[PDB]
Amino acid sequence: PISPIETVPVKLKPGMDGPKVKQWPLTEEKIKALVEICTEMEKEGKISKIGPENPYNTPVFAIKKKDSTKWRKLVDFRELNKRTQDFWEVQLGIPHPAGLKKKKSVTVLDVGDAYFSVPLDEDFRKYTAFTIPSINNETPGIRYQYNVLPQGWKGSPAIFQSSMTKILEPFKKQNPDIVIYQYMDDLYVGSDLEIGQHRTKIEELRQHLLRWGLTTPDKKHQKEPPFLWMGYELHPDKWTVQPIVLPEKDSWTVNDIQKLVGKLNWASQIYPGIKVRQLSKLLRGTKALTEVIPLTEEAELELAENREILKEPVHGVYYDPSKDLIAEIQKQGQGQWTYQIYQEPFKNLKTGKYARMRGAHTNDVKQLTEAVQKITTESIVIWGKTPKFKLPIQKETWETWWTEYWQATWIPEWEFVNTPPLVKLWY
Amino acid sequence: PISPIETVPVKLKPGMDGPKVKQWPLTEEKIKALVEICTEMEKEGKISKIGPENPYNTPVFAIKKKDSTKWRKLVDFRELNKRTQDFWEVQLGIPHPAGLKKKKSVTVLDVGDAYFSVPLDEDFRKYTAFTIPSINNETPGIRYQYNVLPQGWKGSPAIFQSSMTKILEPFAAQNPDIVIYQYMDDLYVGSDLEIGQHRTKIEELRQHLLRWGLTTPDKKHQKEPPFLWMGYELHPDKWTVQPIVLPEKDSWTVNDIQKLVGKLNWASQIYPGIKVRQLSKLLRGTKALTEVIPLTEEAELELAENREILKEPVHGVYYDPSKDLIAEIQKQGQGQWTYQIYQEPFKNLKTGKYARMRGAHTNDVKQLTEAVQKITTESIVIWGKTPKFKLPIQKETWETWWTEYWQATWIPEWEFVNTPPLVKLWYQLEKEPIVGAETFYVDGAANRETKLGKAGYVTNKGRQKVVPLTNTTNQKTELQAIYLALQDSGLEVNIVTDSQYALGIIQAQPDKSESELVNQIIEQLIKKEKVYLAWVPAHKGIGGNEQVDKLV
Numbered sequence A: 001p002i003s004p005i006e007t008v009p010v011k012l013k014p015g016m017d018g019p020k021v022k023q024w025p026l027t028e029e030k031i032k033a034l035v036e037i038c039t040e041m042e043k044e045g046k047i048s049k050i051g052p053e054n055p056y057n058t059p060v061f062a063i064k065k066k067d068s069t070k071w072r073k074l075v076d077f078r079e080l081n082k083r084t085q086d087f088w089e090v091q092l093g094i095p096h097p098a099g100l101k102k103k104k105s106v107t108v109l110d111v112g113d114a115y116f117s118v119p120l121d122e123d124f125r126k127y128t129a130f131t132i133p134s135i136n137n138e139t140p141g142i143r144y145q146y147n148v149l150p151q152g153w154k155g156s157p158a159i160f161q162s163s164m165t166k167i168l169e170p171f172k173k174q175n176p177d178i179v180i181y182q183y184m185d186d187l188y189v190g191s192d193l194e195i196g197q198h199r200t201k202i203e204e205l206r207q208h209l210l211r212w213g214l215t216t217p218d219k220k221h222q223k224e225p226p227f228l229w230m231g232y233e234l235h236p237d238k239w240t241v242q243p244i245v246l247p248e249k250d251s252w253t254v255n256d257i258q259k260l261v262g263k264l265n266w267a268s269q270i271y272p273g274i275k276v277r278q279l280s281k282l283l284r285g286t287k288a289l290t291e292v293i294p295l296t297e298e299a300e301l302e303l304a305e306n307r308e309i310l311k312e313p314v315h316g317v318y319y320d321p322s323k324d325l326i327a328e329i330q331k332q333g334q335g336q337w338t339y340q341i342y343q344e345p346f347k348n349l350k351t352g353k354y355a356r357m358r359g360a361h362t363n364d365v366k367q368l369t370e371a372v373q374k375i376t377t378e379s380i381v382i383w384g385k386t387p388k389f390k391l392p393i394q395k396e397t398w399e400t401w402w403t404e405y406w407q408a409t410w411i412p413e414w415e416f417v418n419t420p421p422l423v424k425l426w427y
Numbered sequence B: 001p002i003s004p005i006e007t008v009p010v011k012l013k014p015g016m017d018g019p020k021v022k023q024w025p026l027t028e029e030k031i032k033a034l035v036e037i038c039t040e041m042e043k044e045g046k047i048s049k050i051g052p053e054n055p056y057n058t059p060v061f062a063i064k065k066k067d068s069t070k071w072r073k074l075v076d077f078r079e080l081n082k083r084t085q086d087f088w089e090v091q092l093g094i095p096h097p098a099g100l101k102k103k104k105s106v107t108v109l110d111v112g113d114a115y116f117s118v119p120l121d122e123d124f125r126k127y128t129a130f131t132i133p134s135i136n137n138e139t140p141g142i143r144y145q146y147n148v149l150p151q152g153w154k155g156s157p158a159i160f161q162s163s164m165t166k167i168l169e170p171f172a173a174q175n176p177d178i179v180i181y182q183y184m185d186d187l188y189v190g191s192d193l194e195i196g197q198h199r200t201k202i203e204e205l206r207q208h209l210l211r212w213g214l215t216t217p218d219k220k221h222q223k224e225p226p227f228l229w230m231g232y233e234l235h236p237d238k239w240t241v242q243p244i245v246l247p248e249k250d251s252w253t254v255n256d257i258q259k260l261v262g263k264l265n266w267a268s269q270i271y272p273g274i275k276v277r278q279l280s281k282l283l284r285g286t287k288a289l290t291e292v293i294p295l296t297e298e299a300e301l302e303l304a305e306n307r308e309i310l311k312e313p314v315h316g317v318y319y320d321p322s323k324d325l326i327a328e329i330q331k332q333g334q335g336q337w338t339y340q341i342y343q344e345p346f347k348n349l350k351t352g353k354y355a356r357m358r359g360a361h362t363n364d365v366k367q368l369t370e371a372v373q374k375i376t377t378e379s380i381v382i383w384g385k386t387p388k389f390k391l392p393i394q395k396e397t398w399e400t401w402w403t404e405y406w407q408a409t410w411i412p413e414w415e416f417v418n419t420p421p422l423v424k425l426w427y428q429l430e431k432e433p434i435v436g437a438e439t440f441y442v443d444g445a446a447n448r449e450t451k452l453g454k455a456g457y458v459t460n461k462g463r464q465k466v467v468p469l470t471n472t473t474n475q476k477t478e479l480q481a482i483y484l485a486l487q488d489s490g491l492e493v494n495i496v497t498d499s500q501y502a503l504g505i506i507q508a509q510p511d512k513s514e515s516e517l518v519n520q521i522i523e524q525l526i527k528k529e530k531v532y533l534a535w536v537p538a539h540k541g542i543g544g545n546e547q548v549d550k551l552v
């Protein structure tokens, strides 16, 4: 493509040097795929080899987007983002529609191929350097830097925003009810249409974007495949902050009423208007744990009142756009995971529960990875930004295998926890 | 001895300027010694004279070694180094021999002038200027620059490897069979070509390099293969560690123990069963180099154990990509582990161990899991794949644990090895309380000042006991109360405690610990048939709590 307007001048935060991040070691298989991909990109002007005078580095990974046959390069621009986008969230920020979360169906479209046309600022190219590593330190890595807007960079859709809103406008006029939102490499398209028409309307957009130059390889063929559900089609109407259920038993043992209640007494840190005392008067006899204790009048009156009080959500819990989002996840067994998204402790902006299957075909790391992506997509749709996870996993075993079931293009901030709670079935 | 290599463009740190430091006192007659070197360097085009205009002088030194037939002189560039840009960092680690492939023949070439053979960027040479001051009254001294990569300079290492790499490309592309490794001023060439063609090919490579001003030798090595490379010993069919010696003393300084634990770690890559438990537990604190540390009794057995291993020599085999990559782990009881990596029954590619100094309450299955983690990383570095594991654990015991553990855990394909000591689960807490079993409402309390406390219990059978405590803390009494209930109860027992801490230790199912109390409790839990531990809010609880808590 012809070089358009000269390269958009890109500056960074005052006194912030480029990213200098070490390159994770990779399998031979991945280095091979990374090599093919890069000599193919270099062959197309997208990237160029660099010298020892470029001291910066940004990690690279080989994932499998279609995971069918061919690989896909995933640059991790988390560090460079923090060093540039913080002044490209300000200088060129894309506005986040608060209505996207209310649409009946939201489809995600990868439009990452768009950027590969536009040149990047010559003076800025240096900071996009990445290294294809060598096994056993045989050869110093293969070093490239970008010549066009890199995928994974937040600064790319910011620079491409005008061109994108222009391509989209003649579709937004025909369909004024459809909310379209560009987060990085993806468009989030949400309509209140019925499922059948919503997909037909997405295909109209795919073809519209195509006859203006943009490809969107995520579709494959809808005609004749084997049994396989779509990659991404969300329904944010379901997404709320779920209430915590108390055990429904026909009779109660001391132990039952002692494991009481499912986060009560700590729920008093979430729902402050709770009295447990007239339930604590139901034992006081140094009883055998397995002994059955009958209900009294005042005991039921502090249960029924402490039950409908949990189905009435917290008050004063609002989103703070200056505070980062925090997502904690708890492994629950039986192929199930519970999570919470918050900013200040016990003030939950969102809670949900991921569920894969009964088991015997899916391991922990796969589940957690899918859960982190699943949560992150909720965070994007809802607040326009991603959370910082506190993962129930050893650091190195995540840093080894996270890229194995990672189908997403963005990457959230990690963090690893070491102390388990008693708050397992408290959720 | 220089070449028309494309120089690499170099900048200074954005706001900085060239170094304008000097040296006033001189070294007497050692000035003309620096003259003889410079003119001979100038004639070779390495340096160039210049008049003192817009100069950035850099201090100059001269130094002879013992019986030096030829003097050697060099410039301290630390100030300039602080002012020049950062580069792409040179080779982090080194290629580990266990992951090299065997060849019919290998050669090693030492590049001559190395740094002075590669030109320096023109617009940057102004900053490498230095002076040769003569006599007094500030008479016009001799001032030069550098036309090539200066010896000590910050950019010399990375620029050289960049040049060398570019220079090898028109030969590597004329020789796909030959593989070449670069490393510092060294070059390590190998091939499966028959020794005739290989000797010719090495000679072609030399003549290539020589026409690019890089001098290389025809016969230089003071010692032939095996190669005394990097603490290693590389033979044509095997690799091993360059011989190390564990020195014997009567008194041990921290530095000497610092050296010893390093020489042992460096040996642990091939010599199986090396231990650094009590030898490292001495360097825990307080750290002071010249301080003399008394050698403990257990630390002396360990050293004796390691000496017995280091006695006879052991070697490792190289990598065959066509054959499986197996790794097997053995437990060594005291929190330490060992592993071997191999493709063949009687030879190892390498060995190694796992530290495990995390926390004060740990578990055998978790430790094993961390070992599989450490090895998978090491495998991915050296060979670029993950090994098939051979592990001393039943699949029932593994399955039970990861299903029960709060963290996510993953483990690649692994097979059980019946060879003891096995990794078991020495006890499992009941998930539900036990009908017919006595209930022990325990609680422990203490004073953080008097350091006195009480550990007691009260049961549903009406039984009660309270034991006084000294030298204790609220966390010690909270566990002592549990331990007491176990002592006094039958083969099945329900225990109720008000301590998140206590329940925390027990529910972690540790089989070993660094607390004698916790270990004793473990012994009881193994001996009991069924144990259910239950939690209850401390302050506002049932009422059987403050019955022994209000005693303190």
Ligand SMILES: Cc1cc(C)c(Nc2nc(Nc3ccc(C#N)cc3)nc(OCCCN3CCOCC3)n2)c(C)c1
Binding pocket: A138, B095, B100, B101, B102, B103, B105, B106, B107, B108, B179, B181, B188, B189, B190, B191, B225, B226, B227, B229, B234, B235, B236, B237
């Ligand atoms: C001190 C030193 C000396 C040399 C020559 C090397 N290089 C080197 N060593 C070996 N092993 C060896 C060492 C010493 C002796 C003796 N005597 C016999 C075999 N195999 C290769 O080359 C292996 C090439 C494998 N491939 C081929 C292409 O894909 C990438 C890697 N390169 C090294 C790494 C260190």
